[PDB]
Design a protein around this ligand. Structure first.
Ligand code: BR
Lengths: 211, 282
């Protein structure tokens, strides 16, 4: 129930051991058919993520950009969700102004990041309409998405277990299990998850499955 | 810093209320070179603008091929049933919208700007773009502030957040290369956001800034506004819609403004070529 995390390769981790989650969130390194200073996952690697086993009833927050506006919609569909909202993060500078200059998009400049909101099954105990679908926040440090999204999700679905894919050390927090290759080792607290992790990885090495 | 999401929960003031310096006319008052680029481009638009042209038509029944010549940009705001949730004119389902034969009037290289609302249209408008032969290439969000009326003013379908924006999807048809086609587009002159105050109830107009973004971006002079109204009639545009009270469109006269000795393109001055954003040498 305090912060929990697993350093891992998202493509290889047997995510069936973590149980079910009321909220799933991912800010993935989409292959956006552009030159990037970090590694990406192919479209097929993204489609094949075992998102469906993480949840029977609940919400998905999927950050998207570029051609992943459409590929993210296809993933939502493949993983069993309907899209019911779309949040944007409007980026401001230190004077709370929009930075309008540069060449920050292919055709128009880009002032926001998009997050698809999907629903699966028939969730209960959620509070609809507490937050707006527009986030206004400065770009801070290494952040790729704004920290405000965690408060919105917690107000939407308080007290439920949540899981984040492709998360970073800064993102670990109560009620969340954070998965990502930049995390420091493995820190599990939920005794149910610990038991299943030991049964599946008898010696702690989360390696590619024996094909 | 402060959490403006929490501030909204506490106060009803939307986060976008605290973005500074959003006004269209007053935009670059403190940024003289940016102001000059916009001013020169608007002057270039005004110099080449056709006089206002408009046609009353029942777009559902109309043979859309009667609109000639081909269009470099098309702006479409079909009246969605979600805009009225007090209907007056015919409301359009996304099936109705998809049936429009847009590909029959769009130029071989051209752009479309489709107001999609904030619900199912974000998905179904993309299907329309596919059908019409465009690729979705930008998403212009109209963000609405509620400075005048805080603050819980909602709600429509299966939403879970309060919806405070509308999306205008931009599509591209044909091949356009930013490296070689600077006589057709000026990229990166505007950003994909418009920020204004929530209009009065029952006012369904979209922000006039959408025209500025389109006119700055594409140098094609043949501009069609489908489902425009009397109040959107504008030089440089052909406005077509059922609620227009009068018509002056003559397809031959309209076409003559773009044919020899004229061009369907605005051209450009040396001063604008030196100010507008361009890629560096390879
Ligand atoms: Br068509």
């Amino acid at each position: 129930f305090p912060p929990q995390w697993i350093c891992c390769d998202i493509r290889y981790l047997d995510v069936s051991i973590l149980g079910k989650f009321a909220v799933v969130m991912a800010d993935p390194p989409w292959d956006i058919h552009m030159e990037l200073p970090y590694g990406t996952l192919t479209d097929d690697e993204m489609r094949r993520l075992n998102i469906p086993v993480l949840q029977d009833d609940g919400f998905l927050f999927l950050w998207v950009t570029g051609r992943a506006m459409e590929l993210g919609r296809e993933c939502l569909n493949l993983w069993g969700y309907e899209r019911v909202d779309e949040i944007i993060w409007v980026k401001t500078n230190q004077l709370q102004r929009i930075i309008r200059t540069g060449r920050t998009g292919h055709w128009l400049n880009h002032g926001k990041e998009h997050c698809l909101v999907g629903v699966k099954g028939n969730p209960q105990g959620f509070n609809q309409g507490l937050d707006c679908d527009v986030i206004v926040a400065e770009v801070r440090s290494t952040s790729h998405k704004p920290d405000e999204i965690y408060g919105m999700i917690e107000r939407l679905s308080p007290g439920t277990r949540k899981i984040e894919l492709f998360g970073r050390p800064h993102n670990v927090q109560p009620n969340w299990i954070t998965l990502g290759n930049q995390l420091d080792g493995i820190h599990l607290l939920d005794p149910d998850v610990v038991a299943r992790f030991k049964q599946r990885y008898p010696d702690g090495i989360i390696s590619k499955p024996k094909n | 810093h402060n959490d403006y999401c929490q501030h909204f929960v506490d106060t009803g003031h939307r986060p976008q209320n605290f973005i500074r310096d959003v006004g269209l006319a007053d935009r670059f008052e403190e940024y003289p070179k940016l102001r000059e680029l916009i001013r020169l481009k608007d002057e270039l638009i005004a110099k080449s603008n056709t006089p206002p042209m408009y046609l009353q038509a029942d777009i559902e029944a109309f043979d859309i091929r009667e609109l000639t010549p081909k269009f470099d940009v098309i702006l479409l705001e079909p009246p969605l049933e979600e805009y009225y949730r007090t209907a007056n004119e015919k409301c359009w389902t996304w099936d109705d919208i998809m049936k429009l034969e847009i590909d029959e009037i769009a130029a071989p290289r051209s752009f479309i700007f489709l107001w999609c609302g904030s619900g199912e249209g974000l998905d179904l408008g993309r299907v329309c773009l596919r059908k019409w032969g465009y690729r979705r290439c930008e998403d212009i969000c109209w963000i609405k502030t509620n400075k005048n009326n805080p603050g819980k003013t909602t709600l429509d379908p299966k939403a879970v957040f309060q919806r405070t924006k509308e999306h205008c999807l931009m599509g591209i048809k044909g091949t356009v290369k930013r490296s070689t086609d600077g006589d057709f587009i000026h990229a990166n002159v505007d950003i994909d956001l418009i920020i204004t105050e929530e209009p009065e109830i029952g006012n369904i107009e979209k922000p006039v800034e959408i025209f500025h973004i389109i006119e700055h971006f594409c140098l094609g002079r043949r501009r069609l506004h489908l489902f425009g109204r009397d109040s959107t009639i504008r030089p440089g545009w052909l406005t077509v819609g059922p609620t227009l009270t009068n018509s002056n469109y003559n397809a031959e006269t309209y076409a003559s403004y773009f044919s020899a000795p004229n061009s369907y393109l605005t051209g450009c001055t040396e001063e604008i070529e030196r100010l507008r954003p361009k890629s560096p040498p390879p």
